[PDB]
């Protein structure tokens, strides 16, 4: 059982965009399975994580379908991912021969074949290593400090639901005609103490 209200009221994320569903009404509906994926990108490429966008990130690393449903959450993380002397442990693809299909990955590092003359196992001329390296420094500009991105996806179709919002309850009364809603059971009546003995 999920609880998105705490996340939405955390008031620390600088980007909370939900496509096809409003965040306020996210506590009153059930899903089957929820997919969560995360990565770190620059502060200027954050606008490329959206349905129907172009750029290096959206073309070679992460692609979102045009019928996407879910939410995109991002927040600045300059204090945790950048160190003096530069951080070179974050990479991003920069050369490729075609665009990614929606929700696809590739981690092959075969040498890129630019120009006409072929090559193999060498990076001398017109043959470039695909993956580049982000250079993160704590003194970089606002548009260059790293950001942490988390994307959620839903389906809302088929199967028995398994993840639900936090349905809550209230207190009980007695000897008064009320509107009880015990679990899925509903109706009106006068609840009173009984001496019946149910089986366990």
């Amino acid at each position, epitope marked *: 059982v999920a609880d998105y209200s705490v996340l939405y009221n955390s008031a620390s994320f600088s980007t909370f965009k939900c496509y096809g569903v409003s965040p306020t009404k996210l506590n009153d509906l059930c899903f089957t399975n929820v997919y969560a994926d995360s990565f770190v990108i620059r502060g200027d490429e954050v606008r490329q994580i959206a349905p129907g966008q172009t750029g290096k990130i959206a073309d070679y690393n992460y692609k979102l379908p045009d019928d996407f449903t879910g939410c995109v959450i991002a927040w600045n993380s300059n*204090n*945790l991912d*950048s160190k*003096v*002397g530069g951080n070179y*442990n974050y990479l991003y693809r920069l050369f490729r021969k075609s665009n990614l299909k929606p929700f696809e990955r590739d981690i092959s590092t075969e040498i890129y074949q630019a120009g006409s003359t072929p090559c193999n196992g060498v990076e001398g001329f017109n043959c470039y290593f695909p993956l580049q390296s982000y*250079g993160f420094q704590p*003194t970089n500009g606002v548009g260059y400090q790293p950001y942490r991105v988390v994307v959620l996806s839903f389906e809302l179709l088929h199967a028995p639901a398994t993840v639900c919002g936090p349905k809550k309850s209230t207190n009980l009364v007695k000897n008064k005609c009320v509107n009880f809603n015990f679990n899925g059971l509903t109706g009106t009546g006068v609840l009173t103490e009984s001496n019946k003995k149910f089986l366990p």
Partner: antibody
Amino acid sequence: EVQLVESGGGVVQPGRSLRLSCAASGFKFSKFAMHWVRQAPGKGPEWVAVISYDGNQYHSADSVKGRFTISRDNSFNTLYLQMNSLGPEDTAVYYCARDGPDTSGYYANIYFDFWGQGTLVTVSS
Amino acid sequence: QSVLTQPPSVSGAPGQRVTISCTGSSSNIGAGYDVHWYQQLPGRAPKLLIFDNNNRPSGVPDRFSGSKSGTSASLAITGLQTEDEAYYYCQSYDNSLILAVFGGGTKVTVL
């Protein structure tokens, strides 16, 4: 073994510029970024500057900014530090340190695992 | 100047235990960054002694241990002998001033 030897210290009058370096050996010099650390006589160590593993990016402490410059030669396994217009409070022992290979949690934590020996630098007349 | 506050000197005698308590502010240690300890024997350059929280490196007796909690850190010497007379410094990182910071150091004395 990872050993570092540095030289270039001496007694100088105020206002003049000096230049000292340390030559490394026993490990791939290109991989590791390296730091400069000074320690006043009888006090705690202090941080000075840092240069990346290719020289494209660098950073310096606020106190010595505008007076201290560091360069790097990846081929000759030496790194250089330039000081201009020495002040009376620049007298200390200067070590060149090596960045830590593995820092476990987080990416901003830094530590020094191998140290040189130090060169006595003093300013007087 | 030492950003991290450290006791000036800790005495002791062979056999028992001694503790060094290095305390920091909210930006340096309270932000979740780790703590490091070196040993500077007299007449020698400082040498790494305890990198990361505890997690001693190669070539050091296990008598030295340390830990961090809250906004301070502590190093413990177990089964102290007479050869530990040296200086010990606590080091960490700061996210506001943006530079590595050192402690004032402690001169451990063995009676």
